[PDB]
């Protein structure tokens, strides 16, 4: 068809200029002349798009298409003397339909200035090696003979090198192997052997609580997850009980020494577990199952304090609403546990360290619950209704958070 601009827009323009009482044939005469000039320029701006080898366009093809038709490039003002603004363009006007049309000059200075990129640089790679396209990141994607393994000996040697580097004898070797896991596109069809190596490892690595072996395997899990190419939820049924035990298990190794390390490992386990519930989500299978196991870990009495601290951390890192609903009716039990560890003269065991870590973590989570959906007031002795664990020091932490909010 031949689509033109509407004539009922051309009469609005004419009567808002001082030219009143225009006929319909006078008004139809305006909207076929200007609709041709739009069609003449958009067909002529198409020349610059096809010779600019882009199709997408950069605000500027219409600026050269106008200059080609001996009409000035600038829009929003027309100079009848032509001399200060010749056919050089001014880049158009950054205007919108949902524009407020009113702005504060001070706000524009306040708004941050964007950074400037490195200048264009030249980088060569390989599309084809003697006919075959390589999988580099610059590329898009009764006697009978014995069977041949689908995995290659380069791939099997790669698996052996990556697994012997990921057990962390040297740190630079680990870090590359972790980046190699994080971005190898062909790491599918090797993924059963990696999942089995992880799963089997943690289970025979908690027989003796070897913390590095576990911290390296959890970093291997994290490096497996952020790889975008591979399909993981076929293997998550092996991945999730491995991270579960890491968080909810006792430490064969004494903890007064690496419990800080152990705590860090638990945090890593709780980070990956929250990611494992963020992805791979279907109805009522994964997130609710680990939530139920965490809550019955919490509810059961006389539970190892290492297991208690790990389950507390796992319950805490589950997001905004989960602590808004699951960390409310239980403060009295937490306080009673802290009071029991406090009473009595035996500190040799790990029960006291576990108690201090659990109380600190629970108190910080309470702080956003106090900040997110409550107003501060009576920060001296009202917390004694919650067994008086953090009290005024908790109030001081809340005040520091308020100061950080003021700085923001």
């Amino acid at each position: 068809s031949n689509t033109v601009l509407p004539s009922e827009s051309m009469k609005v323009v004419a009567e808002s200029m001082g030219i009143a009482q225009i006929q319909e044939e006078t008004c139809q005469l305006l909207t076929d002349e200007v609709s041709y000039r739009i069609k003449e320029i958009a067909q002529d701006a198409l020349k610059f798009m096809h010779m600019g080898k882009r199709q997408k366009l950069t605000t500027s093809d219409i600026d050269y298409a106008l200059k080609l038709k001996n009409v000035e490039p600038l829009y929003g003002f027309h100079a009848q003397e032509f001399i200060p603004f010749r056919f050089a363009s001014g880049g158009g006007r950054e205007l919108y339909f949902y524009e407020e049309k009113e702005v504060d000059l001070s706000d524009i200075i306040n708004t941050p200035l964007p950074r400037v990129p490195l200048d264009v640089c030249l980088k060569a790679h390989w599309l084809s090696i003697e006919g075959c396209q390589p999988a580099i990141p610059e590329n898009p994607p009764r006697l009978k003979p014995r069977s041949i393994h689908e995995l290659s000996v380069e791939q099997q040697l790669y698996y052996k090198e990556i697994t012997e580097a990921c057990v962390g004898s040297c740190e630079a070797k680990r870090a590359e192997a972790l980046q190699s896991i994080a971005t190898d596109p062909g790491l599918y069809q090797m993924l059963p052997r990696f999942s089995t190596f992880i799963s089997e490892g943690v289970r025979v690595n908690v027989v003796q609580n070897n913390l590095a072996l576990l911290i390296y395997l959890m970093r291997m899990v994290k490096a497996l997850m952020d790889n975008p190419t591979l399909y993981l939820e076929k293997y998550v049924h092996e991945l999730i009980p491995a991270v579960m035990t890491c968080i909810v298990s006792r430490q064969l190794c004494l903890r007064p020494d690496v419990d800080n390390h152990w705590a860090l490992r638990d945090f890593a386990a709780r980070l990956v577990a929250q990611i494992c519930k963020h992805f791979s989500t279907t109805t009522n299978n994964i997130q609710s199952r680990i939530t139920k196991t965490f809550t019955k870990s919490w509810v059961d009495e006389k539970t190892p304090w290492t297991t208690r601290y790990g389950s507390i951390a796992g319950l805490a890192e589950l997001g905004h609403d989960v602590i808004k609903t699951l960390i409310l009716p239980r403060l009295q039990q937490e306080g009673e546990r802290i009071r029991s560890v406090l009473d009595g003269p035996v500190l040799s065991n790990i029960d006291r360290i576990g108690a201090d870590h659990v109380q600190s973590l629970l108190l910080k989570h309470c702080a956003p619950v106090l900040a997110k959906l409550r107003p501060p007031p009576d920060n001296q002795d009202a917390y004694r209704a919650e067994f008086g664990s953090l009290g005024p020091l908790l109030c001081s932490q809340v005040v520091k958070a308020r100061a950080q909010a003021a700085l923001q």
Partner: peptide, 25 residues
Amino acid sequence: DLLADENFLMVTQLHWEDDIIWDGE
């Protein structure tokens, strides 16, 4: 939709806590 392979995925049919040995023989 119950015919979808997602229902037959091992993770949906497998309980992780039961799978963990937890040093149990």
